[PDB]
Amino acid sequence: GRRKVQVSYVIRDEVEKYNRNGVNALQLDPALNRLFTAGRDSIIRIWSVNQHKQDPYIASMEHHTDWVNDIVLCCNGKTLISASSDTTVKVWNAHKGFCMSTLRTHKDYVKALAYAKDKELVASAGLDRQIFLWDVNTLTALTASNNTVTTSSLSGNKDSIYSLAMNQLGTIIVSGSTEKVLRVWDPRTCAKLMKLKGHTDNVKALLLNRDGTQCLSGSSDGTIRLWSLGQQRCIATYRVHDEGVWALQVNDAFTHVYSGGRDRKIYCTDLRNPDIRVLICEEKAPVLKMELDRSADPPPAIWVATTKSTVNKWTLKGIHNFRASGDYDNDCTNPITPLCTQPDQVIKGGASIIQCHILNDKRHILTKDTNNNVAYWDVLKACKVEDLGKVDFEDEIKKRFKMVYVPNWFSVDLKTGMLTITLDESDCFAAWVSAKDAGFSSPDGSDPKLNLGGLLLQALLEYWPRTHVNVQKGNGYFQVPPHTPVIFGEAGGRTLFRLLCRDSGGETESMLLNETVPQWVIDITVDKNMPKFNKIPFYLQPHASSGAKTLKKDRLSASDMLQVRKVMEHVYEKIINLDIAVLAEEKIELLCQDQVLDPNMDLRTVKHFIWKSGGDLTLHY
Amino acid sequence: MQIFVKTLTGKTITLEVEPSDTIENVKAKIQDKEGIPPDQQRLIFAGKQLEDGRTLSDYNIQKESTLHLVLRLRG
């Protein structure tokens, strides 16, 4: 009936000031001269474009649990609507900096948003071949009492939608998808109007003019098509790019188009006559989205979002000067000089983690950033230990090679440019580690066996009121930092809830947590039921070189946490015998495939390293 | 490590595996994703059948490797 619920959490600092991955969308509010970045790191950051400001940062509002494919700033720059790949479209508040109401109606990665300023109508198309028209006036009025909105929908698409556009008047909506066909509705009546054909590949950029009688399409095949919706046919094609086109912009007069795609270059094309074109700049990464400066005509500068973490503003002054130069280079052998060399303004960005390696103790991770810097994290404790810096990754791996084995109990995914740990019921409690091995020492010297997955999940919800046992909180061994996100998202699908660790202490988050979290988390977090113990069967036979006669093959069984020292002590006491540990070490040798086994090296370690066979483990004394 | 499998109808499906899982585990995952019992199905990689019991490393199977899936037409 219900799908698989995976609990995830992210290791990150309290504030991620700079971008930690590429930036997917940009929106500019000329009333406040603010800039919104929709980073691929699942964070929305508000900048201050004013050049004289030393620190362009203002604030952040982070609620998405995956990529932020597209954002639209609505209600004269008061409310922000963002489409994310966590199958949700949200309702932020740009002036305040927080999210009000989340829409989970889509059932796949939402990839686009379209805004109709006159009617305040916003559409949200995604990878689930669905279009859901919304009214911002109704959306921003969502409250606890009224949290259900009729899901105004459009039908006709048969392929995952990658782009969406609505004219300002809100009378035409065009969707571009892998179907390579632009399906046009009439949002007032939802009736299908026409299908536009001609694009030979996926279309990712869509623009519409004021009256909705013209459209601009940016396709992944590297061509631009101007659609005259009155005749339901294209009127001009712009083969200006070499590689694909993923971002489009156009001025108010709908006269010049600024395209930018995979080949990291941005041009300005006269829609009337595309013979003239000026290279705005050559970026250091493919361009994903742009946002013109609409405070003047012609636009003074264009903001650009790349696959890198740095956001660059490029100056458009002198475009008329460049066009008046008369440099009509009819020969393609002459490369066009970029209008700008360096960005006029830079928004500093961080480094994205691009390579991950988890050490055999399955507690530490060595992550390699895009600055080639390597880090040393701690999944259980959720904290960075040492930033080793620019040292060779493989050599650092071999330096930190361990001779112990711990079964896999999570997975690491760097989709958001940061380090995220996902826990699944199937394998989360497969790892059991001795207290001394884990690094926690009891005052009396006792060594309990702690399930790392359960010990982590207890701390992930330490503030949860149901978990306070009558006051004992969490697990009592460590404390994951409060600003650490916790995500309860279904397997390979939507996300049900996201909250910081300290959010559980409140009311509304507490009320939603009981419904959102699945039962198997309650199995340990609240019920305090110790999970299953894995067991090992093994064989004990006398060694050929020992000289003793072959004894009966006894298939003894025990736990994986049993040290080889205990087995060898039992063998010494019950075979050859028929203080003790030292004499057994000096007299009795246990060998698997005829090699001495470390007394402190455990049985599952033997299976993984020495036995190397699908049969039952064999031990010889 | 992610491998593809060509189902009976011809559409590919993706599986999350490791280089150290036997063909039985792969067949169980394909059963989960399609419903064919593990004993009935056969897997072909690089023009050779995946004998049950053997792991995945010894077949030099890496990321982006496709395992064609067929049934047993006995006669």
């Binding site: 892998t178 992944s220 493919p286 | 009976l8 109808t9 399609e34 059948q49 982006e64 496709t66 006669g75």
Partner: protein, 406 residues
Amino acid sequence: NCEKRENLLPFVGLNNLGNTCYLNSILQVLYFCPGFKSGVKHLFNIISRKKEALKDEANQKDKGNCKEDSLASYELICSLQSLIISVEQLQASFLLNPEKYTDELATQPRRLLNTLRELNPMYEGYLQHDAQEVLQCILGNIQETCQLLKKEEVKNVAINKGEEQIGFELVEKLFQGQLVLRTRCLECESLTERREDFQDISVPVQEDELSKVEESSEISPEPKTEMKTLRWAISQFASVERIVGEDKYFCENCHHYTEAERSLLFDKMPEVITIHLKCFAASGLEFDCYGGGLSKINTPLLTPLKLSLEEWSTKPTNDSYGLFAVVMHSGITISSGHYTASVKVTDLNSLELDKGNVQSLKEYEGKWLLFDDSEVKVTEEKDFLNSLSPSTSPTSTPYLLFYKKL
């Protein structure tokens, strides 16, 4: 007593051992592959020379490790060549004078069956087995022997000289080809491809139980109606497949589960293309999980006598292919049935023994046959093709198609 008029074709069937219709069909198609007989003859010549040399030098050499794995790999070629020799000798004897063979003319393949059943334990008894699987086992063991021989001769060593290199890569040069596993992420447009070998093309066969339109009225109903031909099935195998939804490609270039377009491309083409029809089906539903919903698609595809993989080949393929043999399952389910080969006896000019060791048989040139186990009957081209069409025969559903490069 004159229902068949005691008419026996010169071509030799094979007396099945009770349930060896699959194996017998596979041996009968393999017999007519172009160069397979010569390749196995060359392998036997090499094996015999090595065996006699080892026998001669066994006394001089000390600590001779004669592992039985190599012995069995050698024995498979031994039995295959013995069976080929027996079949050809009986064919020649019948051709010279057929009075002694008034009944059916066939040779028992006991040696090769025993070799397989000791080589693969699952052929023990007299159960029923997949013909494709038997072909795979035979070809794999032959390739294993060939690569072992190549490694041994390389270790020993270290106008046209290609005659000695004809047989060392028989399976490689006959059945195995090369594929390109091209995958294109749709979020970053980065093409990552793999290069995997192949010997048979696992072509899908689809029953009308999937891809059902929810409404077919408000949405566009359907582009066109067309009887599923072999070109459509190959395209389904090796054309752009948008991986969406429950399964998404994980692009290491962007570290996300992104939609991808997978397209398989035919770079290197083997001299014999095996097309393994998926006449079986899961019926969509599992039948309330009653041990899987096994089913068979009794309605065949419109398989043509010619093929051209240019539509799915990297380089421009100027060489076409031609059907010469088909293995047909004449049952109603997959758990049982009567396997029957159907080969086109041709290539008589090149149908010669290996050099390392036409008009008489031209009477059946370019004519199909129906090797029903020990019983052999000739079927003309037109009626055979008509029976191949789904309208006529819902019983003898084709299973394997072999195409030889022209």
